[PDB]
PDB file of C-alpha atoms in Angstrom:
ATOM      1  CA  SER U  90       0.000   0.000   0.000  1.00  0.00           C
ATOM      2  CA  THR U  91       0.969   3.662  -0.401  1.00  0.00           C
ATOM      3  CA  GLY U  92      -0.126   7.100   0.733  1.00  0.00           C
ATOM      4  CA  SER U  93       0.224  10.613  -0.628  1.00  0.00           C
ATOM      5  CA  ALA U  94      -0.709  13.906   1.027  1.00  0.00           C
ATOM      6  CA  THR U  95      -0.292  17.572   0.154  1.00  0.00           C
ATOM      7  CA  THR U  96       1.622  19.716   2.641  1.00  0.00           C
ATOM      8  CA  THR U  97       1.020  23.465   2.821  1.00  0.00           C
ATOM      9  CA  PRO U  98       3.041  26.317   4.367  1.00  0.00           C
ATOM     10  CA  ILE U  99       1.197  27.980   7.233  1.00  0.00           C
ATOM     11  CA  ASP U 100       2.314  31.520   6.335  1.00  0.00           C
ATOM     12  CA  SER U 101       4.160  33.573   3.728  1.00  0.00           C
ATOM     13  CA  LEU U 102       7.570  32.805   5.279  1.00  0.00           C
ATOM     14  CA  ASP U 103       7.252  28.978   5.207  1.00  0.00           C
ATOM     15  CA  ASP U 104       7.692  28.888   8.979  1.00  0.00           C
ATOM     16  CA  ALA U 105       6.067  25.439   9.097  1.00  0.00           C
ATOM     17  CA  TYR U 106       4.079  23.050   6.924  1.00  0.00           C
ATOM     18  CA  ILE U 107       0.773  21.391   7.788  1.00  0.00           C
ATOM     19  CA  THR U 108      -0.640  18.165   6.362  1.00  0.00           C
ATOM     20  CA  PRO U 109      -4.232  16.927   6.809  1.00  0.00           C
ATOM     21  CA  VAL U 110      -4.505  13.716   8.839  1.00  0.00           C
ATOM     22  CA  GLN U 111      -7.648  11.647   9.474  1.00  0.00           C
ATOM     23  CA  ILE U 112      -7.984  10.316  13.037  1.00  0.00           C
ATOM     24  CA  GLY U 113     -10.771   8.120  14.386  1.00  0.00           C
ATOM     25  CA  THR U 114     -14.076   6.723  13.149  1.00  0.00           C
ATOM     26  CA  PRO U 115     -15.742   8.593  11.664  1.00  0.00           C
ATOM     27  CA  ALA U 116     -12.746  10.596  10.451  1.00  0.00           C
ATOM     28  CA  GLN U 117     -11.716  13.708  12.360  1.00  0.00           C
ATOM     29  CA  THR U 118      -9.381  15.724  10.139  1.00  0.00           C
ATOM     30  CA  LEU U 119      -6.555  17.613  11.849  1.00  0.00           C
ATOM     31  CA  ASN U 120      -3.731  19.596  10.248  1.00  0.00           C
ATOM     32  CA  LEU U 121      -0.489  18.231  11.677  1.00  0.00           C
ATOM     33  CA  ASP U 122       3.141  19.335  11.435  1.00  0.00           C
ATOM     34  CA  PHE U 123       5.150  16.399  10.051  1.00  0.00           C
ATOM     35  CA  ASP U 124       8.327  16.409  12.132  1.00  0.00           C
ATOM     36  CA  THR U 125      11.278  14.134  11.321  1.00  0.00           C
ATOM     37  CA  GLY U 126      13.002  15.521  14.433  1.00  0.00           C
ATOM     38  CA  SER U 127      10.656  13.926  16.971  1.00  0.00           C
ATOM     39  CA  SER U 128       8.768  10.678  17.426  1.00  0.00           C
ATOM     40  CA  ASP U 129       5.435  11.548  19.083  1.00  0.00           C
ATOM     41  CA  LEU U 130       2.030  11.900  17.430  1.00  0.00           C
ATOM     42  CA  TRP U 131       0.282  14.404  19.695  1.00  0.00           C
ATOM     43  CA  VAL U 132      -2.844  16.480  19.115  1.00  0.00           C
ATOM     44  CA  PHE U 133      -4.873  19.237  20.668  1.00  0.00           C
ATOM     45  CA  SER U 134      -7.931  17.504  22.089  1.00  0.00           C
ATOM     46  CA  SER U 135     -11.105  17.892  24.137  1.00  0.00           C
ATOM     47  CA  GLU U 136      -8.858  17.193  27.151  1.00  0.00           C
ATOM     48  CA  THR U 137      -6.631  20.230  26.571  1.00  0.00           C
ATOM     49  CA  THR U 138      -6.976  23.060  29.084  1.00  0.00           C
ATOM     50  CA  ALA U 139      -9.539  25.272  27.400  1.00  0.00           C
ATOM     51  CA  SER U 140      -7.535  28.445  28.065  1.00  0.00           C
ATOM     52  CA  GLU U 141      -4.684  26.903  26.033  1.00  0.00           C
ATOM     53  CA  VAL U 142      -6.800  26.337  22.886  1.00  0.00           C
ATOM     54  CA  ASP U 143      -6.947  29.330  20.509  1.00  0.00           C
ATOM     55  CA  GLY U 144      -8.691  28.269  17.295  1.00  0.00           C
ATOM     56  CA  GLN U 145      -7.122  24.836  16.793  1.00  0.00           C
ATOM     57  CA  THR U 146      -9.144  21.838  15.696  1.00  0.00           C
ATOM     58  CA  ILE U 147      -9.321  19.386  18.604  1.00  0.00           C
ATOM     59  CA  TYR U 148      -9.488  15.592  18.565  1.00  0.00           C
ATOM     60  CA  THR U 149     -12.466  14.221  20.515  1.00  0.00           C
ATOM     61  CA  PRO U 150     -11.868  10.566  21.452  1.00  0.00           C
ATOM     62  CA  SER U 151     -15.377  10.258  22.903  1.00  0.00           C
ATOM     63  CA  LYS U 152     -16.788  10.744  19.385  1.00  0.00           C
ATOM     64  CA  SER U 153     -14.534   8.054  17.848  1.00  0.00           C
ATOM     65  CA  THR U 154     -15.903   4.508  17.905  1.00  0.00           C
ATOM     66  CA  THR U 155     -12.374   3.098  17.429  1.00  0.00           C
ATOM     67  CA  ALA U 156     -10.615   5.120  20.151  1.00  0.00           C
ATOM     68  CA  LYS U 157      -9.359   3.226  23.205  1.00  0.00           C
ATOM     69  CA  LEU U 158      -7.692   4.755  26.249  1.00  0.00           C
ATOM     70  CA  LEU U 159      -4.229   3.293  26.823  1.00  0.00           C
ATOM     71  CA  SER U 160      -4.590   2.676  30.560  1.00  0.00           C
ATOM     72  CA  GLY U 161      -1.941   4.346  32.698  1.00  0.00           C
ATOM     73  CA  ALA U 162       0.108   5.687  29.781  1.00  0.00           C
ATOM     74  CA  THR U 163       1.309   9.297  29.888  1.00  0.00           C
ATOM     75  CA  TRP U 164       3.598  11.380  27.702  1.00  0.00           C
ATOM     76  CA  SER U 165       5.698  14.497  28.185  1.00  0.00           C
ATOM     77  CA  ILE U 166       7.830  16.290  25.588  1.00  0.00           C
ATOM     78  CA  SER U 167      10.187  19.270  25.574  1.00  0.00           C
ATOM     79  CA  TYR U 168      11.216  20.553  22.156  1.00  0.00           C
ATOM     80  CA  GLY U 169      14.513  22.142  21.184  1.00  0.00           C
ATOM     81  CA  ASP U 170      12.929  25.614  21.156  1.00  0.00           C
ATOM     82  CA  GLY U 171      11.856  25.360  24.805  1.00  0.00           C
ATOM     83  CA  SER U 172       8.341  24.168  23.951  1.00  0.00           C
ATOM     84  CA  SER U 173       6.513  21.514  25.929  1.00  0.00           C
ATOM     85  CA  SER U 174       3.260  19.590  26.099  1.00  0.00           C
ATOM     86  CA  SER U 175       1.959  16.559  27.959  1.00  0.00           C
ATOM     87  CA  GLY U 176      -1.082  14.361  28.449  1.00  0.00           C
ATOM     88  CA  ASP U 177      -2.551  10.857  28.222  1.00  0.00           C
ATOM     89  CA  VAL U 178      -2.629   8.344  25.376  1.00  0.00           C
ATOM     90  CA  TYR U 179      -5.307   6.758  23.202  1.00  0.00           C
ATOM     91  CA  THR U 180      -5.024   4.290  20.360  1.00  0.00           C
ATOM     92  CA  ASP U 181      -7.068   4.943  17.237  1.00  0.00           C
ATOM     93  CA  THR U 182      -7.194   4.589  13.474  1.00  0.00           C
ATOM     94  CA  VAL U 183      -5.002   7.131  11.661  1.00  0.00           C
ATOM     95  CA  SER U 184      -4.927   7.691   7.895  1.00  0.00           C
ATOM     96  CA  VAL U 185      -2.570   9.858   5.826  1.00  0.00           C
ATOM     97  CA  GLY U 186      -3.469  10.348   2.173  1.00  0.00           C
ATOM     98  CA  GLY U 187      -5.246   7.001   1.898  1.00  0.00           C
ATOM     99  CA  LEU U 188      -2.685   5.085   3.993  1.00  0.00           C
ATOM    100  CA  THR U 189      -4.372   3.675   7.103  1.00  0.00           C
ATOM    101  CA  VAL U 190      -2.839   2.425  10.353  1.00  0.00           C
ATOM    102  CA  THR U 191      -4.987   0.821  13.039  1.00  0.00           C
ATOM    103  CA  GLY U 192      -4.004   0.936  16.692  1.00  0.00           C
ATOM    104  CA  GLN U 193      -1.780   4.014  16.376  1.00  0.00           C
ATOM    105  CA  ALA U 194      -0.849   5.772  19.603  1.00  0.00           C
ATOM    106  CA  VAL U 195      -2.562   9.180  19.570  1.00  0.00           C
ATOM    107  CA  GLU U 196      -1.180  11.300  22.403  1.00  0.00           C
ATOM    108  CA  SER U 197      -3.869  13.675  23.671  1.00  0.00           C
ATOM    109  CA  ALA U 198      -2.486  16.957  25.008  1.00  0.00           C
ATOM    110  CA  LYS U 199      -3.689  17.924  28.485  1.00  0.00           C
ATOM    111  CA  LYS U 200      -1.493  21.036  28.572  1.00  0.00           C
ATOM    112  CA  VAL U 201       0.567  22.653  25.807  1.00  0.00           C
ATOM    113  CA  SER U 202       3.216  25.346  25.892  1.00  0.00           C
ATOM    114  CA  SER U 203       2.188  28.885  24.986  1.00  0.00           C
ATOM    115  CA  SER U 204       4.097  28.706  21.684  1.00  0.00           C
ATOM    116  CA  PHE U 205       1.700  26.061  20.345  1.00  0.00           C
ATOM    117  CA  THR U 206      -1.276  28.021  21.710  1.00  0.00           C
ATOM    118  CA  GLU U 207      -0.273  31.158  19.779  1.00  0.00           C
ATOM    119  CA  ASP U 208      -0.214  29.120  16.536  1.00  0.00           C
ATOM    120  CA  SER U 209      -3.845  28.425  15.625  1.00  0.00           C
ATOM    121  CA  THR U 210      -2.984  26.762  12.286  1.00  0.00           C
ATOM    122  CA  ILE U 211      -1.149  23.724  13.740  1.00  0.00           C
ATOM    123  CA  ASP U 212      -3.379  21.116  15.389  1.00  0.00           C
ATOM    124  CA  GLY U 213      -0.494  18.884  16.471  1.00  0.00           C
ATOM    125  CA  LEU U 214       2.653  17.045  15.453  1.00  0.00           C
ATOM    126  CA  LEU U 215       3.242  13.736  13.675  1.00  0.00           C
ATOM    127  CA  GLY U 216       6.711  12.480  14.562  1.00  0.00           C
ATOM    128  CA  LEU U 217       8.792  10.653  11.952  1.00  0.00           C
ATOM    129  CA  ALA U 218      12.120  10.200  13.722  1.00  0.00           C
ATOM    130  CA  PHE U 219      12.978   6.758  15.066  1.00  0.00           C
ATOM    131  CA  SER U 220      10.686   5.223  17.675  1.00  0.00           C
ATOM    132  CA  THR U 221      13.420   5.143  20.339  1.00  0.00           C
ATOM    133  CA  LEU U 222      12.688   8.854  20.965  1.00  0.00           C
ATOM    134  CA  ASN U 223       8.987   8.323  21.742  1.00  0.00           C
ATOM    135  CA  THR U 224       8.159   9.689  25.195  1.00  0.00           C
ATOM    136  CA  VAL U 225       5.165   7.504  26.090  1.00  0.00           C
ATOM    137  CA  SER U 226       5.662   5.905  29.516  1.00  0.00           C
ATOM    138  CA  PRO U 227       5.869   3.230  30.802  1.00  0.00           C
ATOM    139  CA  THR U 228       5.314   1.495  27.436  1.00  0.00           C
ATOM    140  CA  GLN U 229       7.076   3.243  24.555  1.00  0.00           C
ATOM    141  CA  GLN U 230       5.048   3.551  21.350  1.00  0.00           C
ATOM    142  CA  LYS U 231       5.864   3.276  17.655  1.00  0.00           C
ATOM    143  CA  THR U 232       5.664   6.110  15.144  1.00  0.00           C
ATOM    144  CA  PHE U 233       3.135   6.213  12.312  1.00  0.00           C
ATOM    145  CA  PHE U 234       5.907   5.257   9.893  1.00  0.00           C
ATOM    146  CA  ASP U 235       7.036   2.309  12.032  1.00  0.00           C
ATOM    147  CA  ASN U 236       3.463   1.019  12.284  1.00  0.00           C
ATOM    148  CA  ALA U 237       2.930   1.408   8.524  1.00  0.00           C
ATOM    149  CA  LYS U 238       6.301  -0.051   7.460  1.00  0.00           C
ATOM    150  CA  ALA U 239       5.042  -3.607   6.954  1.00  0.00           C
ATOM    151  CA  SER U 240       2.156  -2.778   4.598  1.00  0.00           C
ATOM    152  CA  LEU U 241       4.064  -0.182   2.556  1.00  0.00           C
ATOM    153  CA  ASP U 242       5.170  -1.236  -0.918  1.00  0.00           C
ATOM    154  CA  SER U 243       8.620   0.101   0.014  1.00  0.00           C
ATOM    155  CA  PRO U 244       9.751   1.124   3.536  1.00  0.00           C
ATOM    156  CA  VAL U 245      10.334   4.747   2.514  1.00  0.00           C
ATOM    157  CA  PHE U 246       8.731   8.132   2.697  1.00  0.00           C
ATOM    158  CA  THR U 247       9.711  11.222   0.733  1.00  0.00           C
ATOM    159  CA  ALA U 248       9.555  14.929   1.541  1.00  0.00           C
ATOM    160  CA  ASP U 249       9.016  17.357  -1.352  1.00  0.00           C
ATOM    161  CA  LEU U 250       8.579  20.709   0.392  1.00  0.00           C
ATOM    162  CA  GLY U 251       7.632  23.747  -1.656  1.00  0.00           C
ATOM    163  CA  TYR U 252       9.054  27.256  -1.621  1.00  0.00           C
ATOM    164  CA  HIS U 253       6.092  29.541  -0.822  1.00  0.00           C
ATOM    165  CA  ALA U 254       3.984  26.804  -2.414  1.00  0.00           C
ATOM    166  CA  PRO U 255       2.375  23.459  -1.527  1.00  0.00           C
ATOM    167  CA  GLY U 256       4.394  20.257  -1.433  1.00  0.00           C
ATOM    168  CA  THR U 257       3.971  16.504  -0.999  1.00  0.00           C
ATOM    169  CA  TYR U 258       4.689  13.791   1.533  1.00  0.00           C
ATOM    170  CA  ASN U 259       4.629  10.334  -0.075  1.00  0.00           C
ATOM    171  CA  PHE U 260       4.664   7.016   1.786  1.00  0.00           C
ATOM    172  CA  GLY U 261       5.701   3.705   0.253  1.00  0.00           C
ATOM    173  CA  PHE U 262       7.009   4.789  -3.154  1.00  0.00           C
ATOM    174  CA  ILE U 263       9.426   7.168  -4.868  1.00  0.00           C
ATOM    175  CA  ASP U 264       7.818   9.445  -7.466  1.00  0.00           C
ATOM    176  CA  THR U 265      10.453   9.503 -10.207  1.00  0.00           C
ATOM    177  CA  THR U 266       8.708  12.472 -11.869  1.00  0.00           C
ATOM    178  CA  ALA U 267       9.263  14.758  -8.857  1.00  0.00           C
ATOM    179  CA  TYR U 268      13.029  15.275  -9.256  1.00  0.00           C
ATOM    180  CA  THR U 269      15.762  15.664 -11.858  1.00  0.00           C
ATOM    181  CA  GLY U 270      18.926  13.647 -12.334  1.00  0.00           C
ATOM    182  CA  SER U 271      19.834  10.936  -9.846  1.00  0.00           C
ATOM    183  CA  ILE U 272      19.143  10.382  -6.167  1.00  0.00           C
ATOM    184  CA  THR U 273      22.366  10.366  -4.153  1.00  0.00           C
ATOM    185  CA  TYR U 274      22.084   8.193  -1.043  1.00  0.00           C
ATOM    186  CA  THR U 275      24.141   8.678   2.113  1.00  0.00           C
ATOM    187  CA  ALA U 276      24.519   6.715   5.329  1.00  0.00           C
ATOM    188  CA  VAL U 277      22.348   7.387   8.381  1.00  0.00           C
ATOM    189  CA  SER U 278      23.304   6.985  12.037  1.00  0.00           C
ATOM    190  CA  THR U 279      20.376   6.129  14.328  1.00  0.00           C
ATOM    191  CA  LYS U 280      22.420   6.221  17.553  1.00  0.00           C
ATOM    192  CA  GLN U 281      20.640   9.339  18.886  1.00  0.00           C
ATOM    193  CA  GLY U 282      17.275   8.513  17.289  1.00  0.00           C
ATOM    194  CA  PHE U 283      17.511  11.115  14.502  1.00  0.00           C
ATOM    195  CA  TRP U 284      17.881  10.976  10.733  1.00  0.00           C
ATOM    196  CA  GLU U 285      21.545  11.832  11.221  1.00  0.00           C
ATOM    197  CA  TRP U 286      23.983  11.995   8.301  1.00  0.00           C
ATOM    198  CA  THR U 287      27.255  13.688   7.346  1.00  0.00           C
ATOM    199  CA  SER U 288      27.414  16.413   4.707  1.00  0.00           C
ATOM    200  CA  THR U 289      30.636  16.493   2.703  1.00  0.00           C
ATOM    201  CA  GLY U 290      31.086  20.269   2.556  1.00  0.00           C
ATOM    202  CA  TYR U 291      29.708  23.608   1.476  1.00  0.00           C
ATOM    203  CA  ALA U 292      30.161  26.568  -0.846  1.00  0.00           C
ATOM    204  CA  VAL U 293      29.017  30.188  -0.544  1.00  0.00           C
ATOM    205  CA  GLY U 294      27.629  31.677  -3.739  1.00  0.00           C
ATOM    206  CA  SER U 295      29.916  30.706  -6.607  1.00  0.00           C
ATOM    207  CA  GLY U 296      32.999  30.371  -4.403  1.00  0.00           C
ATOM    208  CA  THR U 297      35.176  27.311  -3.985  1.00  0.00           C
ATOM    209  CA  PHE U 298      33.595  24.213  -2.496  1.00  0.00           C
ATOM    210  CA  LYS U 299      35.119  23.528   0.926  1.00  0.00           C
ATOM    211  CA  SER U 300      35.445  19.815   1.660  1.00  0.00           C
ATOM    212  CA  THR U 301      34.670  19.339   5.356  1.00  0.00           C
ATOM    213  CA  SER U 302      32.435  16.908   7.215  1.00  0.00           C
ATOM    214  CA  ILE U 303      29.325  18.456   8.769  1.00  0.00           C
ATOM    215  CA  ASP U 304      27.387  15.996  10.904  1.00  0.00           C
ATOM    216  CA  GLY U 305      23.735  16.976  11.248  1.00  0.00           C
ATOM    217  CA  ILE U 306      20.115  15.839  11.177  1.00  0.00           C
ATOM    218  CA  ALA U 307      17.393  16.118   8.538  1.00  0.00           C
ATOM    219  CA  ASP U 308      14.575  17.832  10.447  1.00  0.00           C
ATOM    220  CA  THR U 309      11.373  18.828   8.660  1.00  0.00           C
ATOM    221  CA  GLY U 310      10.152  20.254  11.981  1.00  0.00           C
ATOM    222  CA  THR U 311      12.804  22.986  12.154  1.00  0.00           C
ATOM    223  CA  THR U 312      12.384  26.065   9.976  1.00  0.00           C
ATOM    224  CA  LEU U 313      15.958  27.260   9.574  1.00  0.00           C
ATOM    225  CA  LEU U 314      19.396  25.864   8.742  1.00  0.00           C
ATOM    226  CA  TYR U 315      21.755  25.644  11.741  1.00  0.00           C
ATOM    227  CA  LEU U 316      25.429  25.082  10.916  1.00  0.00           C
ATOM    228  CA  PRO U 317      28.762  25.487  12.736  1.00  0.00           C
ATOM    229  CA  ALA U 318      29.895  29.006  13.550  1.00  0.00           C
ATOM    230  CA  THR U 319      32.777  28.882  11.054  1.00  0.00           C
ATOM    231  CA  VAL U 320      30.471  28.047   8.138  1.00  0.00           C
ATOM    232  CA  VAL U 321      27.792  30.576   9.108  1.00  0.00           C
ATOM    233  CA  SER U 322      30.381  33.342   9.543  1.00  0.00           C
ATOM    234  CA  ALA U 323      31.802  32.661   6.076  1.00  0.00           C
ATOM    235  CA  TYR U 324      28.312  32.912   4.559  1.00  0.00           C
ATOM    236  CA  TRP U 325      27.274  36.200   6.149  1.00  0.00           C
ATOM    237  CA  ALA U 326      30.676  37.757   5.448  1.00  0.00           C
ATOM    238  CA  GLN U 327      29.530  37.905   1.804  1.00  0.00           C
ATOM    239  CA  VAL U 328      26.420  39.981   2.647  1.00  0.00           C
ATOM    240  CA  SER U 329      27.174  43.689   2.921  1.00  0.00           C
ATOM    241  CA  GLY U 330      26.033  45.093   6.261  1.00  0.00           C
ATOM    242  CA  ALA U 331      25.128  41.720   7.767  1.00  0.00           C
ATOM    243  CA  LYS U 332      25.941  41.188  11.430  1.00  0.00           C
ATOM    244  CA  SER U 333      25.077  38.970  14.375  1.00  0.00           C
ATOM    245  CA  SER U 334      22.692  40.684  16.799  1.00  0.00           C
ATOM    246  CA  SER U 335      22.305  39.654  20.435  1.00  0.00           C
ATOM    247  CA  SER U 336      18.997  41.488  20.881  1.00  0.00           C
ATOM    248  CA  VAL U 337      17.513  39.624  17.917  1.00  0.00           C
ATOM    249  CA  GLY U 338      19.458  36.421  18.607  1.00  0.00           C
ATOM    250  CA  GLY U 339      21.124  35.719  15.285  1.00  0.00           C
ATOM    251  CA  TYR U 340      22.381  37.120  12.021  1.00  0.00           C
ATOM    252  CA  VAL U 341      20.397  39.967  10.459  1.00  0.00           C
ATOM    253  CA  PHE U 342      21.048  41.760   7.185  1.00  0.00           C
ATOM    254  CA  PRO U 343      19.814  44.879   5.366  1.00  0.00           C
ATOM    255  CA  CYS U 344      16.545  43.972   3.664  1.00  0.00           C
ATOM    256  CA  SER U 345      17.853  45.734   0.527  1.00  0.00           C
ATOM    257  CA  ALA U 346      20.686  43.213   0.171  1.00  0.00           C
ATOM    258  CA  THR U 347      20.641  40.294  -2.251  1.00  0.00           C
ATOM    259  CA  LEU U 348      21.609  37.031  -0.668  1.00  0.00           C
ATOM    260  CA  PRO U 349      24.070  34.540  -2.164  1.00  0.00           C
ATOM    261  CA  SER U 350      23.077  30.931  -2.590  1.00  0.00           C
ATOM    262  CA  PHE U 351      24.372  28.184  -0.304  1.00  0.00           C
ATOM    263  CA  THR U 352      25.562  24.796  -1.565  1.00  0.00           C
ATOM    264  CA  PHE U 353      25.870  21.729   0.655  1.00  0.00           C
ATOM    265  CA  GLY U 354      27.434  18.415  -0.295  1.00  0.00           C
ATOM    266  CA  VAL U 355      25.790  14.991  -0.332  1.00  0.00           C
ATOM    267  CA  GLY U 356      28.526  12.497  -1.105  1.00  0.00           C
ATOM    268  CA  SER U 357      29.800  13.724  -4.465  1.00  0.00           C
ATOM    269  CA  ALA U 358      26.563  15.558  -5.343  1.00  0.00           C
ATOM    270  CA  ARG U 359      25.719  19.184  -4.549  1.00  0.00           C
ATOM    271  CA  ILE U 360      22.399  20.700  -3.444  1.00  0.00           C
ATOM    272  CA  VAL U 361      22.066  24.435  -4.122  1.00  0.00           C
ATOM    273  CA  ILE U 362      19.875  26.597  -1.875  1.00  0.00           C
ATOM    274  CA  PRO U 363      18.818  29.765  -3.761  1.00  0.00           C
ATOM    275  CA  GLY U 364      19.545  32.976  -1.892  1.00  0.00           C
ATOM    276  CA  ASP U 365      15.849  33.895  -1.806  1.00  0.00           C
ATOM    277  CA  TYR U 366      15.221  30.850   0.423  1.00  0.00           C
ATOM    278  CA  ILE U 367      17.467  32.388   3.104  1.00  0.00           C
ATOM    279  CA  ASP U 368      15.462  35.645   3.407  1.00  0.00           C
ATOM    280  CA  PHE U 369      13.021  35.437   6.314  1.00  0.00           C
ATOM    281  CA  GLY U 370      11.842  39.029   6.149  1.00  0.00           C
ATOM    282  CA  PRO U 371      11.858  42.003   8.507  1.00  0.00           C
ATOM    283  CA  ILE U 372      12.568  41.351  12.176  1.00  0.00           C
ATOM    284  CA  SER U 373       9.571  43.589  12.969  1.00  0.00           C
ATOM    285  CA  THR U 374       6.829  45.198  10.898  1.00  0.00           C
ATOM    286  CA  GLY U 375       8.311  48.092   8.955  1.00  0.00           C
ATOM    287  CA  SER U 376      11.905  47.299   9.921  1.00  0.00           C
ATOM    288  CA  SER U 377      14.648  47.505   7.311  1.00  0.00           C
ATOM    289  CA  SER U 378      16.595  44.728   9.073  1.00  0.00           C
ATOM    290  CA  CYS U 379      15.787  41.230   7.815  1.00  0.00           C
ATOM    291  CA  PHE U 380      16.302  37.896   9.578  1.00  0.00           C
ATOM    292  CA  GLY U 381      18.642  35.316   8.085  1.00  0.00           C
ATOM    293  CA  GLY U 382      17.738  31.715   7.335  1.00  0.00           C
ATOM    294  CA  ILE U 383      21.240  30.376   8.085  1.00  0.00           C
ATOM    295  CA  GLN U 384      22.135  30.617  11.771  1.00  0.00           C
ATOM    296  CA  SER U 385      24.811  29.242  14.077  1.00  0.00           C
ATOM    297  CA  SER U 386      24.293  25.889  15.797  1.00  0.00           C
ATOM    298  CA  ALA U 387      26.740  26.789  18.589  1.00  0.00           C
ATOM    299  CA  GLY U 388      23.980  27.207  21.166  1.00  0.00           C
ATOM    300  CA  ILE U 389      22.086  24.122  19.978  1.00  0.00           C
ATOM    301  CA  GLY U 390      24.780  21.438  20.192  1.00  0.00           C
ATOM    302  CA  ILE U 391      23.742  19.779  16.921  1.00  0.00           C
ATOM    303  CA  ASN U 392      23.663  20.896  13.296  1.00  0.00           C
ATOM    304  CA  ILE U 393      20.160  20.974  11.817  1.00  0.00           C
ATOM    305  CA  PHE U 394      19.294  20.757   8.113  1.00  0.00           C
ATOM    306  CA  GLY U 395      15.825  22.262   8.471  1.00  0.00           C
ATOM    307  CA  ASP U 396      13.183  23.316   5.969  1.00  0.00           C
ATOM    308  CA  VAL U 397      15.473  25.959   4.435  1.00  0.00           C
ATOM    309  CA  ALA U 398      17.758  23.202   3.135  1.00  0.00           C
ATOM    310  CA  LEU U 399      15.271  20.354   2.647  1.00  0.00           C
ATOM    311  CA  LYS U 400      12.864  22.351   0.484  1.00  0.00           C
ATOM    312  CA  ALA U 401      15.721  22.839  -1.995  1.00  0.00           C
ATOM    313  CA  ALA U 402      15.716  19.070  -2.600  1.00  0.00           C
ATOM    314  CA  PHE U 403      13.650  15.945  -3.098  1.00  0.00           C
ATOM    315  CA  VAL U 404      14.477  13.969   0.046  1.00  0.00           C
ATOM    316  CA  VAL U 405      14.043  10.203   0.468  1.00  0.00           C
ATOM    317  CA  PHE U 406      13.799   8.845   4.016  1.00  0.00           C
ATOM    318  CA  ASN U 407      14.686   5.186   3.432  1.00  0.00           C
ATOM    319  CA  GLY U 408      13.619   3.191   6.484  1.00  0.00           C
ATOM    320  CA  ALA U 409      15.159  -0.107   5.407  1.00  0.00           C
ATOM    321  CA  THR U 410      16.929  -2.174   8.062  1.00  0.00           C
ATOM    322  CA  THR U 411      20.036  -0.184   7.143  1.00  0.00           C
ATOM    323  CA  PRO U 412      18.480   3.303   6.884  1.00  0.00           C
ATOM    324  CA  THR U 413      19.717   5.877   4.376  1.00  0.00           C
ATOM    325  CA  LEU U 414      18.851   9.397   3.226  1.00  0.00           C
ATOM    326  CA  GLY U 415      18.528  10.243  -0.469  1.00  0.00           C
ATOM    327  CA  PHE U 416      18.895  13.712  -1.970  1.00  0.00           C
ATOM    328  CA  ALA U 417      18.009  14.780  -5.497  1.00  0.00           C
ATOM    329  CA  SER U 418      17.802  18.138  -7.198  1.00  0.00           C
ATOM    330  CA  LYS U 419      14.363  19.271  -8.318  1.00  0.00           C
TER     331      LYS U 419
END
């Protein structure tokens, strides 16, 4: 079996992407953020503190004939950006673009952090990292991809994120019409539970390619690209008037500047990020300072190839027993 679903940016800056997901019987459709950087499927629900719900669609297990409370199970998550939520656990039927999993752990949020509350367009997260990061206690739960792996034609899913435009998540097959050239595959380490791989280098604009290993994770749930301080400094040195700002917390640049592209290596292949992808607009309404899409990972501890980089490519998440990541130009 296979599944295919359209993913849509939530705003004009591509800060996140939402994908419709059907939960329960009859179907309750929620718009979830597909996150390859976490492993929990959690939703706003009827159980969420009503003061913490600001326009989201909520999952109501009492209206689902296939929902079953998972007795004694709880969950609690803290995200890299200091966000948190927690609650209890149901199992239910979950379908993504025609692909159906029965008995999927659906983690119902009892309380969410304010950052999720402020964001009325995201009804929850669907984690697609490896199931060893799932936070359900005392019995850890499998991700939607892990539960679907057996019935998929091929144990893969692909991310085809759009620039200011809709994209596609496919499960179980590789659409050979969605990319150009060849797919270059690279090894994945699962030792920390992430889709972790090693980039072979970078170039700024049309400068020389610098061969250097950059270990990092493919994270659809992170907006920006976070790279080591040396790389980020070399990029912004080519933008006139750019500087790192402590008050803003990152590199900013004059909105009148034109940004150079950024190339990152995948084995012997090269993925080019157009400079327009790196512009994230004014830091405040009416400001002439614009926020940069390439920031330092020094405070994070891990390099993150977020949406800025992934949307420049067709990305295959190969969940075979030896997992790999595939990149192709598009």
